[PDB]
């Protein structure tokens, strides 16, 4: 695979969003990946509604601001036949009744792919697919107060991931 | 010296414009490759 990849350079990534005091990171990670795939498909980058996911994907297994999984959100989009734009269904940072409206749907999917649990496999996916949804162990003050450079935490775990985020590429420092 | 370019959802003031460089090829650091997926479109 290439030495370096940065999908932001190619228009696959929307500006950084803020989930606030709500455990809806799984929804942001999901909209991030969908945003990247829809762009690859249509050439148009449109911000997607995390609120839509927070309020409506309970049947698929998500728990709104109490947590969830990106795969459950992808399953919701597939079951629902769509997902509203961020503009049509603004983020509120708290769970509300489902207000999905098909007229405002700008995205859809036909399932999801779980990447083999190996960094080499993740690299191939990022290189050939685009931004990838992932979960990481962010349960450390070192992550909360991260400032710059390559993040490395000795006490990090590969078993208790608690934060859903988006890998938009990879590279190396000089 | 390798890293994964990660986009966070805690606003653009946190980290590097809302992004974080995470250790890559360091024994699946922080489980970054343990729950990775993407939607099929």
């Amino acid at each position: 695979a290439p030495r370096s990849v940065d999908w932001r350079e190619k228009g696959y990534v929307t500006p950084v969003k803020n989930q606030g005091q709500c455990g809806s990171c799984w929804a942001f990670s999901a909209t991030g990946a969908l945003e990247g795939q829809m762009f690859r498909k249509t050439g148009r980058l449109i911000s997607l509604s995390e609120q839509n996911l927070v309020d409506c994907s309970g049947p698929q297994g998500n728990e709104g601001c109490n947590g969830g999984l990106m795969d459950y959100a992808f399953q919701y989009v597939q079951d629902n036949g769509g997902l509203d734009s961020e503009e049509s269904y603004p983020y509120e940072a708290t769970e509300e009744s489902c207000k999905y409206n098909p007229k405002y749907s700008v995205a859809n999917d036909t399932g999801f792919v779980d990447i083999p649990k190996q960094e080499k496999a993740l690299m191939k996916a990022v290189a050939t697919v685009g931004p990838i949804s992932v979960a990481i162990d962010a349960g450390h003050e070192s992550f909360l107060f991260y400032k710059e450079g390559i993040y490395f935490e000795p006490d990090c775990s590969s078993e208790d991931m608690d934060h859903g985020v988006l890998v938009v590429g990879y590279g190396f420092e000089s | 010296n390798k890293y994964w370019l990660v986009k966070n959802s805690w606003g653009e003031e946190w980290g590097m414009g809302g992004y974080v460089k995470m250790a890559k090829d360091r024994r699946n650091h922080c489980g970054i490759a343990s729950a990775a997926s993407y939607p099929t479109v």
Partner: peptide, 4 residues
């Protein structure tokens, strides 16, 4: 933040 978390909640994955």
């Amino acid at each position: 933040x978390c909640x994955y």
